Amino acid sequence: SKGEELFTGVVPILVELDGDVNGHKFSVSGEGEGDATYGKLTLKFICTTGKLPVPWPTLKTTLVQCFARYPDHMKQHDFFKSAMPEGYVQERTIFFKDDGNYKTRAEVKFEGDTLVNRIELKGIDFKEDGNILGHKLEYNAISGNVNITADKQKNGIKANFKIRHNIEDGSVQLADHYQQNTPIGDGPVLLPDNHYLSTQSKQSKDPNEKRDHMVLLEFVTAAGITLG
Numbered sequence: 001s002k003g004e005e006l007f008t009g010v011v012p013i014l015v016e017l018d019g020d021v022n023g024h025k026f027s028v029s030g031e032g033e034g035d036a037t038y039g040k041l042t043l044k045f046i047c048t049t050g051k052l053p054v055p056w057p058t059l060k061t062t063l064v065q066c067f068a069r070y071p072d073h074m075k076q077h078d079f080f081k082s083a084m085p086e087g088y089v090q091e092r093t094i095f096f097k098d099d100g101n102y103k104t105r106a107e108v109k110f111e112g113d114t115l116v117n118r119i120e121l122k123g124i125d126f127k128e129d130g131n132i133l134g135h136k137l138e139y140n141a142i143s144g145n146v147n148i149t150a151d152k153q154k155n156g157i158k159a160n161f162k163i164r165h166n167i168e169d170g171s172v173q174l175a176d177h178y179q180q181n182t183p184i185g186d187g188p189v190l191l192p193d194n195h196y197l198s199t200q201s202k203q204s205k206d207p208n209e210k211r212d213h214m215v216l217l218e219f220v221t222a223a224g225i226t227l228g
């Protein structure tokens with residue numbers, strides 16, 4: 001695609017999120033860069049409104065799958081880059097088992113040479129002392145396989161995957177994700193054969209940063225289709 005050509009070197013990234021979870025309102029800003037040749041993302045997120053009222057790990061998926069490394073032989077299945085520069089809408093519902101849900105809407109697009117992710121998030125039906133509003137998650141890595149299907153009716157894609165977040169008492173909190181992406185522009189897109197994105201993230205802190213924040217180092221690689 002012509003959009004893929006936008007991703008052959010290191011691209012600056014900006015993320016801006018406004019959230020409301022059970023009436024707790026917050027905002028997050030992110031800055032970093034992506035290098036899709038290696039599926040590599042480095043980001044720092046800052047809660048601009050004070051302390052983040054939910055755990056950072058529950059926001060990681062919400063806070064740029066256009067930076068996935070697609071293997072050469074799978075490049076015709078990269079929807080995300082084919083929609084650029086005009087971008088796409090990414091919507092999710094994320095179900096926390098035995099707890100509330102996030103509903104997210106984002107637009108991902110170029111503004112100049114910067115890839116920007118602007119998001120709104122709504123959480124409802126959270127338990128006041130469950131794992132999320134009780135802050136019982138470990139500030140712990142996450143990984144998984146994002147399963148992608150074509151959505152021909154919407155000239156886009158669907159995806160579904162589970163995140164298992166470790167809890168401080170040694171249990172696991174499941175977060176079942178449902179996703180849809182649709183192009184913003186009316187230019188040509190690539191609609192993929194079924195495949196997945198193998199994704200892993202390490203979270204850390206800027207020891208010099210007093211604000212509530214998260215630093216991420218993430219790798220995202222398309223898989224599941226064999227050459228030939």
Ligand code: NA
Nearest residue numbers: 008035036037
């Ligand atoms: Na690159």
